[PDB]
């Protein structure tokens, strides 16, 4: 009847309005995270047994707060009652209310909670990580309700895009405070659970956006002072959001309040080792895995990933004028220099040089090279520069006047044109027509293309999923060999190319590859395994035919980088390029029937095939730093015997100092490259392949995990789902048996062909139509929440008649 | 007919560039902008007005003696 | 300069970040302004403050690297100038 | 649903002690993770207050592994023997999830007051 409604409201705010039927339930689609003994996943299920009431604000207007009430059994009733009685005093628990009503002649029990919010955090996280712009109604409602935007904003089409409409960051960042408060109240909930002696597993689908918690249904009780919270899935699923919405932006104000001035850090202070641990203890107190503020203390590669992931987030709070090399005044032959004696990354903490020799007597040729390539001496003796054309952090000016470089138009070969028009070509209405021309560019063309690095944002990665995608991508590369090679074995083509800055003032690469005997090069390559050498990259424009008027800019890295990177990587690089029948197809020619062999390779044994391909919009500049780091780690993994563990870490640090944040010398003044690959280094064409395979595996993982595991009919793939979730989140160490299992599943139902980001995939289709493998929308979702680019469906094709390739 | 316009815009920009027109940044910016719009045009009539605008730049100076160069 | 030695002595370890040496010891500042609107907010008048110091404007030049006097850069006269203006200044004490 | 640990693992006995050489014969009980790629016990269930080293010879018998233990946990159960206060000892470095599994199994199949 109606006494139900006046019973539910209880004591406070009896402004109850039914939000459906009466004494019956209310079924809605919500995103859970289920793992019982029969099903895993992070998928939208059908929540049924709950009657939802909405409160009325004054003036008779509907307010954003609800009174849910479940209806379930009798043992869960008392169990819930006891656990709530124990957990009531915490501020981060929503007020329950247990009562018995009657529908027919029986006291059906209820849990009439109070003052909810319509959505949990699980809906927010799912909708951001599983985007589909065709139907994003839940995201629209969640955005409008919390005053982040207004409904009139969504009439501006391509609103969701990141390249177009770059203002959407300002819309998303308005959700930071709610998420930060959720983090804090989760910490307080964990403290209450521990001190109360309760053992339980935490999910996001039991936390309204305000911060409170509920559903103490599957908890168990232990002795007080000895409880344990389980937070592996919660934090790891929530990781990618904390940099979409900048949830830690309120940590740079004077007393962490948004209505205060900014903290003014000291100029010279660069350590920030205590602050990182304080942040970790405040927000991630119960993440029971050691977090090393500086990664030079890490034990192996996976710990380096696990600590770089946290440093990425914690480095966006500290000022960007303290990062970079940490120079030191060194006396040589009675003269003070300024030379780099370390580094300070955002993703690896502080790294110190091991072999530094102040009060040196004389400099060898190796010393002269390693001192004429460091930006410290250059920048520390140049005028300041404040460039308002760009948003990238400028550093200094080496000269007194900037230089403007233009791009000339290509010339005309008239005789061929006359011959063409003689033979009845270029007639109006013909299919063949001129479209590829030599475009021209005005004075400020170089800097207007360097400015595109503004599409690079500090991104967090789902670490407990990357620590498995990296295993599978690793298994994809177990067919080849690699190792360090000596100076007398490197193979270099075209020895008369430029030597970078400032070496291009004296001669081409031949001179520097010539003056060093076969012992100087090895001395340098063994020096870099215990030191860090920052370098200065030049930026040049290409002059080639094209169909689009945008310029193309390529980075000419200095010789001191590629000279050692060749020795480090060349064995593996030339073992990849000399293999036929693999996934990567670098080196396989299309002449003499190679293309036919490739196409018949990728059609291998799939059952109901359907082609699918793609390419990435601005692949080099939209690259996050974590995926670059992981790609370099996967490439350097093969050195299990030739190098130690400190040597491998210092080589990785050198790579990050040379191709990830190196001081680009664009024009006539140094800038700071924020992130992304520089396309003119030694291992671009293979790092891109590693990236592409990583995205493919991530799409497969997301597509298989996020499926309702009660409709899947083939038993084996359901067991695959369950074990996949188990080894992803409920586990900590690699399980090579299941890694082999999943890799076999992939290569049997997802065939691939890869070059540097230009891929082709042949997939079983009657599975992809049931979401057991990656479709072409899954790559859109992954690129959205991980690469920060929206994949337009005018660049991804899909083909179904295999007779045409 | 438009292909002839694109080709003549290419050669016109080349002769303008070797006439040392890029010493004044604004003029070179206007010229390169017009040339890019001519090359990307899909129809003939706007190509021709941008063409005459681009040719007026060459006619403006005195470096290209026209009466001799027009020898028929 | 003695300022570089001064800021290198005050470090706890003698190692200071690279991105603060020019910021706190440079004797000349270069600005690049794309349009008059940005010029008004930053390099307004013969003195301006950046990096918590005092600078005086000197030798304003345009893209063609020809000297432009300060009175010319008005609102209405702006469309008659090459407009990556490079405004130089020196550190005042 | 997100359940803690479906099904329990098992119970056995093992050896422990106070130092490296203080490892006497069977003096505790261990719940173990049954993995095909090796053997891994979870928790040391004992009556003596200050055990600090535990030991178990390798399956080959040539080697033997020492397992350091964290500070103990105080709990009791109900049995025909009456109030019988044991100390739960965890291997050092045990992660939260396995603590949850062992504690859930203990509270499920064994009484506590
Ligand atoms: Mn729940
Ligand atoms: Mn429940
Ligand atoms: Zn670590
Ligand atoms: Zn090696």
From Swiss-Prot, chain A:
Domain Nsp12 RNA-dependent RNA polymerase: 362-805
Names of required cofactors: Mg(2+)
Binding positions (Zn(2+) 10): 484, 639, 642-643
Residue numbers spanned by region RdRp Fingers C-ter: 618-676
Superkingdom classification of source: Viruses
Regulation affecting activity: Inhibited by Remdesivir antiviral drug (GS-5734) through non-obligate RNA chain termination.
Annotated region (RdRp Fingers N-ter), positions in chain: 364-578
Residues given in the record as Zn(2+) 9 binding sites: 292, 298, 303, 307
Span list, region Interaction with RMP Remdesivir: 542-552
Region annotation RdRp Palm N-ter: where it falls in the sequence: 579-617
Outcome reported for the amino acid change (mutating residue 320 to L): In strain: Alpha/B.1.1.7, Beta/B.1.351, Gamma/P.1, Delta/B.1.617.2 Iota/B.1.526, Kappa/B.1.617.1, Lambda/C.7, Epsilon/B.1.427/B.1.429, Theta/P.3, Zeta/P.2, Mu/B.1.621, Omicron/BA.1, Omicron/BA.2, Omicron/BA.2.12.1, Omicron/BA.2.75, Omicron/BA.4, Omicron/BA.5, Omicron/BQ.1.1, Omicron/XBB.1.5, Omicron/EG.5.1
Nsp12 Interface domain span: 263-361
Domain RdRp catalytic: 609-771
Residue span, NiRAN domain: 4-258
Quaternary organization: Interacts with nsp7 and nsp8 to form the replication-transcription complex (RTC): nsp12, nsp7, two subunits of nsp8, and up to two subunits of nsp13. Interacts with nsp9.
Protein purpose: RNA-directed RNA polymerase that catalyzes the transcription of viral genomic and subgenomic RNAs. Acts in complex with nsp7 and nsp8 to transcribe both the minus and positive strands of genomic RNA. The kinase-like NiRAN domain of NSP12 attaches one or more nucleotides to the amino terminus of NSP9, forming a covalent RNA-protein intermediate that serves as transcription/replication primer.
Protein name: RNA-directed RNA polymerase nsp12
Residue range from the parent sequence: 4396 to 5200 of 7096
UniProtKB/Swiss-Prot annotation, chain B:
Domain RdRp Nsp7 cofactor residues, every copy: 1-72
Subcellular location: Host cytoplasm, Host perinuclear region; Host cytoplasm; Host endoplasmic reticulum
Top-rank taxon: Viruses
Subunit-level organization: Interacts with nsp8 and nsp12 to form the replication-transcription complex (RTC): nsp12, nsp7, two subunits of nsp8, and up to two subunits of nsp13. Eight copies of nsp7 and eight copies of nsp8 assemble to form a heterohexadecamer dsRNA-encircling ring structure.
Function: Plays a role in viral RNA synthesis. Forms a hexadecamer with nsp8 (8 subunits of each) that may participate in viral replication by acting as a primase. Alternatively, may synthesize substantially longer products than oligonucleotide primers.
Name of this protein: Non-structural protein 7
Organism: Severe acute respiratory syndrome coronavirus 2
Full-protein positions shown: 3861 to 3932 of 4405
UniProtKB/Swiss-Prot annotation, chain C:
Function: Plays a role in viral RNA synthesis. Forms a hexadecamer with nsp7 (8 subunits of each) that may participate in viral replication by acting as a primase. Alternatively, may synthesize substantially longer products than oligonucleotide primers. Interacts with ribosome signal recognition particle RNA (SRP). Together with NSP9, suppress protein integration into the cell membrane, thereby disrupting host immune defenses.
Protein encoded by which gene: rep
Outcome after substituting residue 19 to S: In strain: Omicron/BA.2.75
Subunit structure: Interacts with nsp7, nsp13 and nsp12 to form the replication-transcription complex (RTC): nsp12, nsp7, two subunits of nsp8, and up to two subunits of nsp13. Eight copies of nsp7 and eight copies of nsp8 assemble to form a heterohexadecamer dsRNA-encircling ring structure.
Protein name: Non-structural protein 8
Location in the cell: Host cytoplasm, Host perinuclear region; Host cytoplasm; Host endoplasmic reticulum
Domain of life: Viruses
